[PDB]
Structures are given as structure tokens and as C-alpha cells.
């Protein structure tokens, strides 16, 4: 009884023709369930995402009159009926799933409504404004639309529950915390025509736990250690010189991780500004002793250590006051 219904629906059917091709635009209602948001790759400016993509539209050619209300079908009928050519506009690489069978579902109601769902894994490009790193926040988008059908042919619209997520604790976000998400609608003009574009924006804020312990605190300690020489006597040339140049070597070693997981962007991130200023302070402390040693011994001038005992901590605390307020509250 169901075999006859399926056979009759495809009799005299052309999957190459849009439903109501010369009547009105085909309205497609889209629903998305985000299984997981994969790691953000700042080097490649992209993120991974696994979703359940559901599209709903009406196809008058698939109306069937019977006691059955809906035909719950597997993926073998996807290639027999017309399917929207929905593609993700910022997907660098995306793929469906085929284990153990194609991860696709097709349900057809008696009034011609079709529900088409498939599981997708998408690597979507995301342009990261890496200023203020590692105190940076991003809204990585996910845009999809039809490929060949303009706004006069295919129109997309979100459902009452557009995007659903899971528990957010099974996700693979290493560097970021998921803040929130938003969905928008827009029409984009191209040479082929005007297209309806659906967009989802995932707002991500970078977690700062690693950078404080690994980078900020050690760099602060090295700068404080370089201030020790201001209390060592000026006659202890081997002690102050070795302390000054070894903190420079330590600061150079620490400076090698300021730009490690991020691309070779040529603007100064917040992490690089802090490391560079720390390198200047330890550089200036060693130069401070060199100036003091030359003028005192090798011919106010002789009170440089007393001035540097207060000026260096004051200027470093003043720099930290400006630095942390600007990137956290400004």
C-alpha cells in the first residue's frame, strides 16, 4: 500500500524543476541543531562545527491522499525529488556523513510538505580581529543560501526555534568560551542576482587563564627581578651585570611564546605590547647600571640608583594601570 503511494508520487516527476517554478518563490524554513563547535584555528582563521541541518518546504507534486499522514523515509529518496541547493557561503571545506549509511532523513506529509534533514561537518572561515589578544572577543558567522536560485526563486526563513545547541560542555572549545549566538536575515547582490542569505553568529570570548600564569606573571616577575640590581652596591660589577643580562636572556626566552598559536599578523596585539614593554624595562635596567658605572668610576649623576629605586616601579605600575584598564574596561 505504501509502495504504490511512493511509485505514484515519482510518476511524471521532474526533480530538475523548482516547485512553482513560474508561479512564486519557494519558501524554505530552516532549522539548525549545533552538535558541537570545534576548535577555533586562529592560524587558518576558521572554526569547525557539526550540525543537524533541517529544511522544510512545500512541493505540490508530492501530495498523496491516503489514510497515511506522513511517509518517514531513509536517504534513498533524496536524489529522486527536488532538493534546495543550499550551500554555506563561508565554508572552506564541508562534508556530509556516510557511516554506516548516509546521515539523511526525508519525511513527506500528505499536503506536500517535505522535511529534509542531514548531518553536516563544516569548517567555516572566521576573520579574527586579533587586536586586544588574549582579551579578544569574536563573532564567528555561519552563512548559507541557495547557489543558483535568486530571491525571486527561493526564499529562506527561520523557524520558531531557529538554532538549538546541546549542553555546551561536550564542545571542543579550547581557547574560547561560548558567550551567545544570534541569527540574521539579509539579501546579498551578486552578478548572478540577488540572494537571500541566512546567517548565524557565534560569539566567542577568549579564556585568559593560560596567558596570565604562563606569560603575564612570569614577565612581571622578571621585570621585578631586574629591579634588584638597584639595591645591589654599584661596586659589585659582576653581580649587577650578570643579573641584568640574564634577565634579558630570560625575557627573550619568554618573548618567544607571545605570538605562538596566532598567525603572523603585523599589528601589535595586547600580548605583544606587554612583552615588548617588559623587554624595554629589563633593557633599561641594564643600561641604567652601565651609565652609573661609567660616570661614577670611569669619569644627579651619582644618585641614579636612588632615583631608579622609585622611578622604575612607579613607571611600571603606571604602565600596568593604563594597560589593564584599556583592554578590560575601555
Amino acid at each position: 500500500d505504501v509502495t504504490v503511494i511512493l511509485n505514484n508520487l515519482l510518476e511524471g516527476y521532474d526533480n530538475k524543476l523548482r516547485p512553482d517554478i513560474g508561479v512564486k518563490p519557494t519558501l524554505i524554513h530552516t532549522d539548525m541543531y549545533v552538535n558541537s563547535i570545534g576548535p577555533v584555528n586562529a592560524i587558518n582563521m576558521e572554526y569547525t562545527i557539526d550540525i543537524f541541518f533541517a529544511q522544510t518546504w512545500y512541493d505540490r507534486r508530492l501530495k498523496f491522499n491516503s489514510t497515511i499522514k506522513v511517509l518517514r523515509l531513509n536517504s534513498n529518496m533524496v536524489g529522486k525529488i527536488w532538493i534546495p541547493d543550499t550551500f554555506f557561503r563561508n565554508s572552506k571545506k564541508a562534508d556530509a556523513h556516510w557511516i554506516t549509511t548516509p546521515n539523511r532523513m526525508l519525511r513527506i506529509w500528505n499536503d506536500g510538505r517535505v522535511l529534509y534533514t542531514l548531518r553536516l561537518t563544516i569548517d567555516a572561515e572566521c576573520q579574527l580581529q586579533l587586536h586586544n589578544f588574549p582579551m579578544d572577543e569574536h563573532s564567528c558567522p555561519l552563512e548559507f543560501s541557495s547557489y543558483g536560485y535568486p530571491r525571486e526563486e527561493i526564499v529562506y526563513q527561520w523557524k520558531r526555534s531557529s538554532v538549538e545547541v546541546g549542553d555546551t560542555r561536550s564542545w571542543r572549545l579550547y581557547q574560547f568560551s561560548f558567550v551567545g549566538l544570534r541569527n540574521t536575515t539579509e539579501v546579498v547582490k551578486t552578478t548572478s542576482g540577488d540572494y537571500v542569505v541566512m546567517s548565524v553568529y557565534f560569539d566567542l570570548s577568549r579564556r585568559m587563564g593560560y596567558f596570565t600564569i604562563q606569560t603575564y606573571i612570569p614577565c612581571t616577575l622578571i621585570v621585578v627581578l631586574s629591579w634588584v640590581s638597584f639595591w645591589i652596591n654599584k661596586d659589585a660589577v659582576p653581580a649587577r651585570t650578570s643579573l641584568g643580562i640574564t634577565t634579558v636572556l630570560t625575557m627573550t626566552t619568554l618573548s618567544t611564546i607571545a605570538r605562538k598559536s596566532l598567525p603572523k599578523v603585523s599589528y601589535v596585539t595586547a600580548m605583544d605590547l606587554f612583552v615588548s614593554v617588559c623587554f624595554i624595562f629589563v633593557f633599561s635596567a641594564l643600561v641604567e647600571y652601565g651609565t652609573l658605572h661609567y660616570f661614577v668610576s670611569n669619569r644627579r649623576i651619582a644618585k641614579m640608583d636612588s632615583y631608579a629605586r622609585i622611578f622604575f616601579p612607579t613607571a611600571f605600575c603606571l604602565f600596568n594601570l593604563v594597560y589593564w584598564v584599556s583592554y578590560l574596561y575601555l
Binding site: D95, R104, E164, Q175, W231, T250
Partner: protein, 343 residues
């Protein structure tokens, strides 16, 4: 001859778009897993590899046959023309259905219309890791699977035997470098989605991270560097170059060790247990150099005591530091290893 004839008639009037017993009963699938090799686990990707012989059994009443034989083996061309469950792994990322040298699949039909469906797969599933306890972390990596298109009212999954006896892991195949497979927990359930309710089968593999490598590579070198910094408390206060070089080079050594240890861990942005231990070790080595700067501030005469005038007494800061620093560091180790190893 008879074997050929039954195969020709086996799919006459057969619609593979309809699940068996549609409109009469829910399709019952008895699953069965044989883990050949619980493959490598990637901390940097939060995913694990597993090699299994995934089995599924159900009844297709339309495929009953009469003949001298009792079991029919179907080739891959005919197996693709027969309805099979649309089983998928919920947490799988990119699995492989092996095709060498032929499709590693086998469909067998019993006389009463019972189908046994076996396939060899390399499932690359996901495992959500919370590495706050790293390297003393334990994880329960799941393997959830079920039907994609059929809700619980159409296709139902169950384990063929008792759930603990349905996932059989190979004794030889463990393939874990930094984990120990304590055991697996097997259970089923129902999940809720916008498209209905689905039967889900879960299998959790419990992994305990091995710590011996991290003790010798990170913890022991960091502990000994903290000891060397406190060794400076016994050097005489008049050896300013020696005590200065001792302090800064230990800080440089700690910095060298801190970077190396962090480079081994996956790039998470939250502080782990190893991060706190190194941070505290960084504080002790920092404080030892600060301690000498205070001792040197109250040193009066440059010369030290000779073999046989006034001479500097032993610093009270030095004498108390010889006790406070080792005792505080020993206290910190007692709290640290009790908090993370007793969980």
C-alpha cells in the same frame, strides 16, 4: 543450482525504501560490537580512534526463503538492494568503512528471514576532555550510536546479550600510549530532539592518564630546581656574584622548564594542575632571589671569613630562610599531591 534460483527470487517484489514490518511493529535491531583495537586518543583534538566489528541483527519477514540450505550469504551488490538500519554514531567525526580489498561488510540471511549484518569500521569519535586535573586526569570517552531517520516508534535498538557482554574488547588490542583502559560501561536510553524521540546506545570507555612520564620530565626537574634555589641560603653572604648568578639562572632554568611542559599539553586556555605547580615553583625560585637581595642589603663588609678584624655574622634572614622555604615547599607539595591524587 538451487542456491542461484533462491537468490534470483529473494528480492522480487521487495521495496528497500520501507523498513520491515512497517505499519505492524517497531523494527528491533540487536546490536553487537567487537572492539578489535581501541586506537590512539588525541588530546589536541579531543577525539579517539576505535576499530570495531560493528554487528546488527534484525528480522525482515519479506526475505524468508525455502530451500535445502539454511543460511544465505549475500554479495555487496545484493546487500545494497536490501533495507538496512541507518545506524550512525552521534559523536563520530570522520569514520572509515574499509574497502580493501573488497567492501569489509557481510550480510547473511537465515532461513526464517533473520538478517545478520557485520561491518568493519574505524570510528573516529569525539571525547569531551576537561583537563583541569592534567596530568592527573581521568576521562570517560563515550560512543553513542542510533538511528538517524527512524524514531523510537519505528526502529528500536538493543544489545544482543547483557550490555556489559555486548561490547567485547580485544585483550591484545589496547593501542593506548598515555592512557590505561580501566573498563567500559554499556547502557541504552532515549534522546529528545525536534524530530522525535530516538533510541540511543552508549558505551563509555574509562581512561586513566599515566603519570610516570610527567613525574620524570616535569615534576622532578621542577622540584630539584626549587631545591637548588634554596641551596643558595647556605652560601656565605659575601659571595654576591655567586648568589646572584645562582638565583637568576635558576629562574632562567625554571622558565626553560615551564615553556617545555606547557608545549606538551594541548593548547587549552585554562590553567591545569601542572600550570599551578609550575607557577608555585616559579614563585619559590623568584622569592629565593628576592631573599638574597634583602640579605645583601644588610651586609656591611665585602670580605668573608678567612682560614684563621671584625667579620660579618651569619644573616638571620639566611638562617630563617633555610627553614621556611624548604618547609613551605614541602607543605605545598603535601597539599598539592593530596588534592589531585586522592580524587
Amino acid at each position: 543450482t538451487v542456491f542461484t534460483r533462491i537468490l534470483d527470487r529473494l528480492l522480487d517484489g521487495y521495496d528497500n525504501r520501507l523498513r520491515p514490518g512497517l505499519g505492524e511493529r517497531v523494527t528491533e535491531v540487536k546490536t553487537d560490537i567487537f572492539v578489535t583495537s581501541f586506537g590512539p586518543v588525541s588530546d589536541h583534538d579531543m577525539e579517539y580512534t576505535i576499530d570495531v566489528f560493528f554487528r546488527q541483527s534484525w528480522k525482515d519477514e519479506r526475505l524468508k526463503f525455502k530451500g535445502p540450505m539454511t543460511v544465505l550469504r549475500l554479495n555487496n551488490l545484493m546487500a545494497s538492494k536490501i533495507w538496512t538500519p541507518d545506524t550512525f554514531f552521534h559523536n563520530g567525526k570522520k569514520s572509515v568503512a574499509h574497502n580493501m580489498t573488497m567492501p569489509n561488510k557481510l550480510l547473511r540471511i537465515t532461513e526464517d528471514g533473520t538478517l545478520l549484518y557485520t561491518m568493519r569500521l574505524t570510528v573516529r569519535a569525539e571525547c569531551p576532555m576537561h583537563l583541569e586535573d592534567f596530568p592527573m586526569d581521568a576521562h570517560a570517552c563515550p560512543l553513542k550510536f542510533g538511528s538517524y531517520a527512524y524514531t523510537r516508534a519505528e526502529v528500536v535498538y538493543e544489545w544482543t546479550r547483557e550490555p556489559a557482554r555486548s561490547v567485547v574488547v580485544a585483550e591484545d588490542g589496547s593501542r593506548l600510549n598515555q592512557y590505561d583502559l580501566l573498563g567500559q560501561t554499556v547502557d541504552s536510553g532515549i534522546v529528545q530532539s525536534s524530530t522525535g524521540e530516538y533510541v540511543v546506545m552508549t558505551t563509555h570507555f574509562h581512561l586513566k592518564r599515566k603519570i610516570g612520564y610527567f613525574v620524570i620530565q616535569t615534576y622532578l626537574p621542577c622540584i630539584m630546581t626549587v631545591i637548588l634555589s634554596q641551596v643558595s641560603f647556605w652560601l656565605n653572604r659575601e659571595s654576591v656574584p655567586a648568589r646572584t648568578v645562582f638565583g637568576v639562572t635558576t629562574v632562567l632554568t625554571m622558565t626553560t622548564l615551564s615553556i617545555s611542559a606547557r608545549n606538551s599539553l594541548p593548547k587549552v586556555a585554562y590553567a591545569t594542575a601542572m600550570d599551578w605547580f609550575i607557577a608555585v615553583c616559579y614563585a619559590f625560585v623568584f622569592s629565593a632571589l628576592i631573599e638574597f637581595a634583602t640579605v645583601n642589603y644588610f651586609t656591611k663588609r665585602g670580605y668573608a671569613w678567612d682560614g684563621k678584624k671584625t667579620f660579618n655574622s651569619v644573616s638571620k634572614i639566611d638562617r630563617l630562610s633555610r627553614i621556611a622555604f624548604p618547609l613551605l615547599f614541602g607543605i605545598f607539595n603535601l597539599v598539592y599531591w593530596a588534592t589531585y591524587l586522592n580524587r
